[PDB]
RNA sequence: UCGCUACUACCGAUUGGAUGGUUUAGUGAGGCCCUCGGAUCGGCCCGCCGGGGUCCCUGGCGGAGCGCUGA
RNA sequence: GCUGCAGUUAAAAAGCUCGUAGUUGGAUCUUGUGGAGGGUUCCCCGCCCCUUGCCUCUCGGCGCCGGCCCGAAGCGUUUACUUUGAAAAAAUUAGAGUGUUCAAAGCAGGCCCGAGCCGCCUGGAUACCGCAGCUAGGAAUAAUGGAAUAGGACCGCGGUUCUAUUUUGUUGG
RNA sequence: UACCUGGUUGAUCCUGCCAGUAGCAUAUGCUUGUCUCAAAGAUUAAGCCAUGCAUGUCUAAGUACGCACGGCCGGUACAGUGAAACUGCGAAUGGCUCAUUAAAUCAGUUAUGGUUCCUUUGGUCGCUACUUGGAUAACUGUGGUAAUUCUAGAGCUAAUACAUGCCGACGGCGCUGACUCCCUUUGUGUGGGAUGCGUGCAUUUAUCAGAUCAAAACCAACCCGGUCGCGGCUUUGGUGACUCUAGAUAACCUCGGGCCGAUCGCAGCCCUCCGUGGCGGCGACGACCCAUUCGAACGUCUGCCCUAUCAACUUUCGAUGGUAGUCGCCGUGCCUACCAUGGUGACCACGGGUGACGGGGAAUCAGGGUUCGAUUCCGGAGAGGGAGCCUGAGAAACGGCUACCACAUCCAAGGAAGGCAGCAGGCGCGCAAAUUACCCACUC
């Protein structure tokens, strides 16, 4: 098939070799998975040993997480922007590790919400009012200064991240190559990496 | 220095985070960024200058993923155009037994030298050890570089 | 085929280099003579197992004490 | 081809420390996978009918291991060509005696009876310590044991002396300068004597020395040391003669004056 | 040097013949992967019969969307 | 033809010189006695300045009556060389033991009671295994190096600077 | 045993070679009484192959309604022998040959801290249940084609096949916080607290901690010796070296695509007690992960025959390196995208030849050497030539399958079938190589 041999390519002083014997099994190939975005479609394949092996297809949700607090949700995924080795993968939208891609981040928002008993990024106060009001002011009193004011001194979303949600989509990596493992993991943009990200995106698209 | 990315990604040391908290040093202060090095055992002494600097490299035996492990040699440098990666020979004598002589020869190696070491000049010694496979023909990395050996690198008042 | 045999074997006597030669022809027909035996080959079987102590003996005695 | 693992064994290939002759026939018996390697092992095969004689051709082995005779350490094996090794303590019931693997001084197994109120405990060496799940720590011996929660001072190459019925560590030897040691590899095989030294290459095969009870020192590698005693006083029985290595020239005199011609 | 008889290799019109290997250009069997496809075979939802219980649950026969769902 | 050939005339020294790799390279940088093994000076200890060359410690054992004394940790500027250890499959080779009826071979065999011993003794050694890699002594011979517009050692001092995390019980200024 | 002898001349002294001389291994000629060992289609043609055989397998312990045989009459789990057939395992070892192949293979030396591992050995096994589902083979019966270890339709029935899915014993703790209870309203100092979500191992991402160092002086709350401002204290394992091992937090989860037993055979017991509730032994089997074993794979240093009538080679058709990925069991231009312009050579690169598979070894041998090694041990490579893959722990397998090339067989001209460089045997080739025998008794 396609093969990962050494030996069918040339040594340092320019020299041919002469082909040592057939292909052999353990020098095996297989063609790449090329996940898309989409309803999952997730395959399997028997790899060396039993072992399955998790190749995607067509993924649609990633476990990413917010180092600063500490948080991780389950969330939905929306597009890739920014391909750090080929650029013909973004046009493509295909999803591979380390990949820059833009998330919902609503999670990320009801859980800050409802530790820190503060709004993120709002437009108005009108529709504050109806419903979710009567999470950030309650009947408590002792436990509503005992506790939130440890939750004060803290609430500082950054500029950057603070400037995202009111759009409600967040920048995020993937660390983890959904073609062997079946999933797209990763983290959440933050510090020097995000204005890295972002002057390259504005530079080169657009 | 403070610049340091210039390929199409981010480049960070992993098993370091930037975290985001208590913001007040005034006026100036911490980069915002601690390093990470480690030890290599058997003697070899870290270089401060890898502690101190502040660079990226997978490959360093200092400071990112690699572990010395084999074999250790040492020969002298007599090409440095390849980025980051140096070419040195080693000489030594074959006998042919027949007659009851030496025979001279030789072999050039590719190594790899990281950036902490940076005022290296063809004509030194370099003690190199064994790595992983880091390239096609690059199995070595410096360790310890040494202009010991006359015809030095500066004249005689050090 | 692998095979549950010896293949060990050993010649036991050497021929002399001058085939024709008077000095040994007449000592060698003497010694045949003396001790009834059959063939010359008889003889140099035993010529055999005396030079071949002869080089244990040479190689000690070339050793140091 | 090979494509997979063999599973023949080749008469001249064999260990030499088996014994085996050259013109019986082309195989040898290929000692089964087991906790012992290969070449330090010694098949129940060849210790039933090379050694002591009971059987006479292979099918004789198979049928005396059917009848559950043989005991390796307590339990009771069947398979003929299972791989014994050193500190390994056969007993055969249905005769009441018993035997201990070790090396006689010429560097390879015999016969060995040992007495019924001492073939209940044997000796292992460790070979690792690791800190398992939850935090319980484990050991592995030379014979591929596991024990689980051992004595927090137990460390690398010191000694155990376990039970054939519970396992469970009962006394342990430690690795230090002045014991005594049994040498179980390379040119010096089945020699005894007190460790006084070990230097330390790191990295390489750190070297330790000896010193036999007749000023006799031989080096040796540290992986094939095996501390058989606390110092000048092994817990174990020995074999005649007791690991002293005597040469070729005081071998001939002890032939000849006790003329060990006949019985 | 010329002339005789034997043998050995050389050049060469034929642009020799065959054989084998290279190789640009074009076609490309068959397997694997992927995106489709959907022959055909099932199950749960409505009657009559037999069991329980207060019309439902089971087993069977038949038919309506065959609706949905599985391979 | 390395041990080991030949080049006036027998086959053979480029017409002549210059020249990079290669091969080869001058001399020179420490000796006597008290005891020990071997003699009548000379060849494990310390003495003319040195003698495993020192250091300074620290944690753990070895001593004396706390105080002071000596083994270990650093290695000595680097190699080649030489010597010793380690580690290296068997068969083949050299080699030990053993009347196959002798030998080539083989790894066996040897003892006493008629059976009433329900047995006993013993073997299946050893040497070799170039080069390259590993390990510790020796320092002759051969490469190689130290301060010349200097920098070695004594806690000698001033200026200047980064910084370590301990104690003041801890936590924080 | 460190050896020479004939031959140019009319004769002599030399250089110098041709010839003799001894061993060895292939062929061949003449001759042949005994007895112990024992090589033998390598050389040419890795050319082609008639026939037969070389790989099968059942225990107390997966599935027994073949009446096939069967006994004391009964299957009331069901006796007992047991063909066949489903299921499991093995078929990847062994054997044969030497075409390929010159830093390749191979040898010694080392490394996996960069990976996988059927089996054996030892660990590990607790967050309708007195037992679930439908459907196949052997067997009965009807068939088609000239033909094959070709198979279709119908009627039955098993499981350790296939596929679902409980019970036990959770009394766990963390985060939540309606409340309420004292002293400070508050804030802050109190103790309980119902109500709620997560709470086994493994997989994937992110984070946290992973301690002790050499002493003092003032400020706030403060333990303790005890009072209305002082002396005294701190916490897995390992390495030369880890981004190791163990721990904590927030989540994630592979279904039809991880684990925690709907399986089988001998031997027994207690009943607030009369066969049910209960519990006691010994095994066979399967299974997650860890170790161990037999390996396998990739990698480091040094080591090769002849050739200059081979002096420069290598590169967007990856050549040397960097960054990020794809892929893979893991390291890696292994492969893709962008970037740099490098790497090798008179110490013989690169190209060419080898009647070249490498080594342990063999012949001759004063000392040094020369020549041989297809051949029983170890390593490699290949089943006519090239290519692709299924199944499996393991194959790029040919006593497996698919296709092209070259051969060749059967035919009813529609179609089907094949691989002796296994053992014998035959043709061919050549100077050149044995019987279409016997047997699992020995080694395995
Ligand atoms: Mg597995
Ligand atoms: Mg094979
Ligand atoms: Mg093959
Ligand atoms: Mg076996
Ligand atoms: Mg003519
Ligand atoms: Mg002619
Ligand atoms: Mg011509
Ligand atoms: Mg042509
Ligand atoms: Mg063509
Ligand atoms: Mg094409
Ligand atoms: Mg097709
Ligand atoms: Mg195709
Ligand atoms: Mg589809
Ligand atoms: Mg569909
Ligand atoms: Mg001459
Ligand atoms: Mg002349
Ligand atoms: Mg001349
Ligand atoms: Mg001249
Ligand atoms: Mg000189
Ligand atoms: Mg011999
Ligand atoms: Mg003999
Ligand atoms: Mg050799
Ligand atoms: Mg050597
Ligand atoms: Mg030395
Ligand atoms: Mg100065
Ligand atoms: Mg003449
Ligand atoms: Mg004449
Ligand atoms: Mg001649
Ligand atoms: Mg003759
Ligand atoms: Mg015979
Ligand atoms: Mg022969
Ligand atoms: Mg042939
Ligand atoms: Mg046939
Ligand atoms: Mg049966
Ligand atoms: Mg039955
Ligand atoms: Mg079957
Ligand atoms: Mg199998
Ligand atoms: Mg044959
Ligand atoms: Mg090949
Ligand atoms: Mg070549
Ligand atoms: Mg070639
Ligand atoms: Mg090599
Ligand atoms: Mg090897
Ligand atoms: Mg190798
Ligand atoms: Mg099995
Ligand atoms: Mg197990
Ligand atoms: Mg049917
Ligand atoms: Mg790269
Ligand atoms: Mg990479
Ligand atoms: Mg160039
Ligand atoms: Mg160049
Ligand atoms: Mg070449
Ligand atoms: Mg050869
Ligand atoms: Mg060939
Ligand atoms: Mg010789
Ligand atoms: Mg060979
Ligand atoms: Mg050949
Ligand atoms: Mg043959
Ligand atoms: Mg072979
Ligand atoms: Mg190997
Ligand atoms: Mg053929
Ligand atoms: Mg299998
Ligand atoms: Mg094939
Ligand atoms: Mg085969
Ligand atoms: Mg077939
Ligand atoms: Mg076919
Ligand atoms: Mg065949
Ligand atoms: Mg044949
Ligand atoms: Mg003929
Ligand atoms: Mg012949
Ligand atoms: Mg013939
Ligand atoms: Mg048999």
Redesign the pocket.
């Known amino acids: 098939?396609?093969?990962?041999?050494?030996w069918?390519?040339?040594?340092?002083?320019?020299?041919?070799?002469?082909?040592?014997?057939?292909?052999?099994?353990?020098?095996?190939?297989?063609?790449?998975?090329?996940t898309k975005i989409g309803p999952?479609?997730?395959?399997?394949?028997?790899?060396?040993?039993?072992?399955?092996?998790?190749?995607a297809?067509?993924l649609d949700?990633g476990?990413?997480?917010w180092?600063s607090e500490?948080?991780?949700?389950?969330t939905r995924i929306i597009d890739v922007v920014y391909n750090?080795?080929?650029?013909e993968l973004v046009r493509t939208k295909t999803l591979?590790?380390?990949c820059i891609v833009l998330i919902d981040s609503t999670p990320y928002r009801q859980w800050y919400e409802s530790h820190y008993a503060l709004p993120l990024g709002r437009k108005k106060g009108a529709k504050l009012t109806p419903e979710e009001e009567e999470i950030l002011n309650?009947?408590?009193?002792?436990?509503?200064?005992?506790?939130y004011?440890?939750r004060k001194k803290n609430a500082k979303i950054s500029s950057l991240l603070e400037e995202q949600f009111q759009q409600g989509k967040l920048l995020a990596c993937i660390?983890?190559?959904?073609?062997?493992?079946?999933?797209a993991?990763?983290?959440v943009l933050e510090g020097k990496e995000l204005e890295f990200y972002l002057r390259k995106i504005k530079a080169r698209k657009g | 220095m403070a610049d340091i990315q210039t390929?199409?990604?981010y480049?960070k040391?992993?098993?370091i985070?930037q975290?985001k908290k208590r913001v007040l040093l005034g006026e100036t202060g911490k980069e915002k960024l601690p390093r990470?090095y480690?030890?290599?055992?058997?003697?070899f002494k870290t270089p401060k200058e890898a502690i101190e600097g502040t660079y990226?490299?997978?490959?360093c035996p200092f400071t990112?993923?690699?572990?010395?492990?084999?074999?250790?040699?040492s020969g002298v440098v007599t090409?440095?155009?390849?980025?980051?990666?140096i070419?040195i020979r080693?000489?030594?004598?074959?006998?042919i037994?027949?007659?009851?002589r030496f025979?001279?020869?030789?072999?050039?190696?590719?190594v790899?030298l990281s950036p902490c070491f940076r005022d290296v000049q063809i004509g030194d010694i370099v003690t190199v050890?064994?790595?992983?496979?880091?390239?096609?023909?690059?199995?070595?990395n410096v360790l310890k570089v040494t202009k010991?050996?006359?015809?030095?690198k500066q004249?005689?008042?050090? | 085929?692998?095979?549950?045999?010896?293949?060990?074997?050993?010649?036991?006597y050497?021929?002399?280099?001058?085939?024709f030669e008077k000095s040994?022809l007449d000592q060698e027909l003497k010694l045949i003579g003396e001790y009834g035996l059959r063939n010359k080959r008889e003889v140099w079987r035993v010529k055999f197992t005396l030079?071949?102590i002869r080089?244990?003996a040479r190689e000690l005695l070339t050793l140091d004490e | 081809?090979?494509?997979?693992?063999?599973?023949?064994?080749?008469?001249?290939?064999?260990?030499?420390?088996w014994?085996?002759?050259?013109?019986?026939?082309?195989?040898?018996?290929?000692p089964?996978?087991?906790?012992?390697?290969?070449?330090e092992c010694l098949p129940l095969?060849?210790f039933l009918?090379?050694?002591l004689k009971y059987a006479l051709?292979?099918?004789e082995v198979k049928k005396i291991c059917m009848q559950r005779f043989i005991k390796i350490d307590g339990?009771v094996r069947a398979?003929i060509?299972?791989?014994a090794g050193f500190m390994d303590v056969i007993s055969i019931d249905k005769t009441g005696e018993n035997f201990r693997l070790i090396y006689d001084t010429?560097?390879?197994f015999?016969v060995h009876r040992i007495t019924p109120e001492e073939a209940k405990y044997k000796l292992c060496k460790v070979?690792?310590?690791?800190?398992?799940?939850?935090?319980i720590?484990?050991l592995?011996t030379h014979?591929?044991?596991?024990?689980?929660y051992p004595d927090?001072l137990i460390?690398?190459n010191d000694t155990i002396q376990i039970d054939l019925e519970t396992?469970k560590i009962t006394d342990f030897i430690k690795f230090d300068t002045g014991n005594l040691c049994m040498?179980t590899?390379?040119?010096?095989l089945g020699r005894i004597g007190v460790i006084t030294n070990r230097?330390?290459?790191?990295?390489?095969?750190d070297?330790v020395h000896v010193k036999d009870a007749n000023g006799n020192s031989?080096?040796?590698?540290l992986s094939?040391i095996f501390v058989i005693g606390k110092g000048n006083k092994p817990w174990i029985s020995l074999p005649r003669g007791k690991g002293i290595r005597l040469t070729?020239a005081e071998?001939?005199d002890k032939?000849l004056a006790?003329k060990?011609?006949?019985?």
């Open positions: 098939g396609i093969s990962r041999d050494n069918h390519k040339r040594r340092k002083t320019g020299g041919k070799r002469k082909p040592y014997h057939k292909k052999r099994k353990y020098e095996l190939g297989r063609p790449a998975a090329n999952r479609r997730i395959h399997t394949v028997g790899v060396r040993g039993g072992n399955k092996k998790y190749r297809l067509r949700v476990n990413f997480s180092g500490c948080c991780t949700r389950k750090a080795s080929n650029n591979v590790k380390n309650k009947k408590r009193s002792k436990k509503i200064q005992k506790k004011d440890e660390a983890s190559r959904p073609g062997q493992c079946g999933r993991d990763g983290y | 390929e199409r990604a480049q040391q992993p098993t985070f975290n990470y480690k030890n290599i055992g058997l003697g990226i490299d997978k490959k990112g993923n690699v572990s010395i492990r084999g074999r250790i040699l090409k440095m155009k390849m980025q980051r990666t070419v080693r000489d030594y004598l074959h006998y037994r027949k007659y009851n025979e001279k020869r030789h072999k050039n190696m590719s790899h050890g064994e790595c992983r496979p880091l390239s096609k023909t690059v199995r070595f010991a050996a006359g015809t030095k004249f005689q008042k050090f | 085929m692998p095979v549950a045999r010896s293949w060990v074997c050993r010649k036991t050497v021929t002399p280099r001058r085939p040994r030079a071949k080089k244990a | 081809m090979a494509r997979g693992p063999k599973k023949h064994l080749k008469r001249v290939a064999a260990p030499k420390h014994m085996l002759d050259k013109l019986t026939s082309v195989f040898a018996p290929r089964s996978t087991g906790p012992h390697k290969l070449r095969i060849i009918r090379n050694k051709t292979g099918d339990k398979d060509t299972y791989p010429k560097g390879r015999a070979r690792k310590i690791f800190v398992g799940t939850k935090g720590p484990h592995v014979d591929a044991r596991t024990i689980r927090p460390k690398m396992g040498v590899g390379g040119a010096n230097e330390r290459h790191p990295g390489s095969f070297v031989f080096a040796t590698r094939n070729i071998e001939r032939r006790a060990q011609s006949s019985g």
